[PDB]
Design an enzyme around this catalytic site. Structure first.
Site, PDB file in Angstrom:
ATOM      1  N   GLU A 111       2.617  39.386-110.758  1.00  0.00           N
ATOM      2  CA  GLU A 111       3.208  38.574-109.750  1.00  0.00           C
ATOM      3  C   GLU A 111       2.198  38.398-108.959  1.00  0.00           C
ATOM      4  OE1 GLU A 111       5.848  37.184-109.618  1.00  0.00           O
ATOM      5  OE2 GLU A 111       7.461  38.254-111.053  1.00  0.00           O
TER       6      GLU A 111
ATOM      7  N   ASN B  93       7.775  27.614-104.518  1.00  0.00           N
ATOM      8  CA  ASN B  93       8.569  27.251-105.730  1.00  0.00           C
ATOM      9  C   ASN B  93       8.933  25.669-105.600  1.00  0.00           C
ATOM     10  OD1 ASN B  93      10.070  30.408-104.936  1.00  0.00           O
ATOM     11  ND2 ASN B  93       8.380  29.930-106.486  1.00  0.00           N
TER      12      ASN B  93
ATOM     13  N   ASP C 149      11.730  24.307-105.860  1.00  0.00           N
ATOM     14  CA  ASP C 149      12.691  24.021-105.064  1.00  0.00           C
ATOM     15  C   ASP C 149      12.696  24.274-103.679  1.00  0.00           C
ATOM     16  OD1 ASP C 149      12.612  26.835-104.470  1.00  0.00           O
ATOM     17  OD2 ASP C 149      14.717  27.398-105.251  1.00  0.00           O
TER      18      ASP C 149
ATOM     19  N   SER D  78      11.623  26.919-101.940  1.00  0.00           N
ATOM     20  CA  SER D  78      11.459  28.553-101.443  1.00  0.00           C
ATOM     21  C   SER D  78      10.082  28.949-101.496  1.00  0.00           C
ATOM     22  CB  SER D  78      12.437  29.427-102.175  1.00  0.00           C
ATOM     23  OG  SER D  78      12.130  29.577-103.538  1.00  0.00           O
TER      24      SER D  78
ATOM     25  N   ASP E  35       7.665  32.564-102.566  1.00  0.00           N
ATOM     26  CA  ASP E  35       7.577  34.083-102.839  1.00  0.00           C
ATOM     27  C   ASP E  35       6.298  34.630-102.225  1.00  0.00           C
ATOM     28  OD1 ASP E  35       9.548  33.270-105.118  1.00  0.00           O
ATOM     29  OD2 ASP E  35       8.120  33.492-106.493  1.00  0.00           O
TER      30      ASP E  35
ATOM     31  N   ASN F  32      11.441  36.373-103.089  1.00  0.00           N
ATOM     32  CA  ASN F  32      11.763  34.729-102.806  1.00  0.00           C
ATOM     33  C   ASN F  32      12.550  34.657-101.560  1.00  0.00           C
ATOM     34  OD1 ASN F  32      12.943  32.217-105.409  1.00  0.00           O
ATOM     35  ND2 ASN F  32      12.274  32.161-103.391  1.00  0.00           N
TER      36      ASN F  32
END
Ligand SMILES: [Cl-]
Ligand SMILES: [Cl-]
Ligand SMILES: [Cl-]
Ligand SMILES: [Cl-]
Ligand SMILES: [Cl-]
Ligand SMILES: [Cl-]
Ligand SMILES: [Cl-]
Ligand SMILES: [Cl-]
Ligand code: NA
EC number: 3.2.1.17
Length: 129
Positions: free
Chosen positions: A35, A46, A48, A50, A52, A59
């Site tokens: 990660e 992201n 969309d 958002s 992380d 998220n």
């Protein structure tokens, strides 16, 4: 902060992640490796919109507030910036909620694609714990 592998293993265990919801410590270290490469300051946007955050790439769509993810929730009740601290407490507490949500560690797509089913014990091999 960029953790060493055993250093992170130790911090995660200290914060009660080891075998949390049945997930051995090597699972958590493996997830953190892919990660964030063990970097607490890691952030990634992201598609969309958002973002992380942190060692476990939590998220903003569901778990933390960053003030720029429309329609999202803040189920860990924290600013996403808290997830970038050198102290992993906020990330661990929030990860405990995520992994309790119903799908276990599958919430972390990198864990599903790179850690699940593998020899995750290698990640804690040789560590003084
Ligand atoms: Cl490593
Ligand atoms: Cl393990
Ligand atoms: Cl927001
Ligand atoms: Cl922005
Ligand atoms: Cl919320
Ligand atoms: Cl906030
Ligand atoms: Cl810590
Ligand atoms: Cl599970
Ligand atoms: Na949010």
């Amino acid at each position: 902060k960029v953790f060493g592998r055993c250093e992170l293993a130790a911090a995660m265990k200290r914060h009660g992640l080891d075998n949390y919801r049945g997930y051995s410590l090597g699972n958590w270290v493996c997830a953190a490796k892919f990660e964030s490469n063990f970097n607490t300051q890691a952030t990634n946007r992201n598609t969309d919109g958002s973002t992380d955050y942190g060692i476990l790439q939590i998220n903003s769509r569901w778990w933390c507030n960053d003030g720029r993810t429309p329609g999202s929730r803040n189920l860990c009740n924290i600013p996403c910036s808290a997830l970038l601290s050198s102290d992993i407490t906020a990330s661990v507490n929030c990860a405990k909620k995520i992994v309790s949500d119903g799908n276990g560690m599958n919430a972390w797509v990198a864990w599903r694609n790179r850690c699940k089913g593998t020899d995750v014990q290698a990640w804690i091999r040789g560590c003084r714990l």
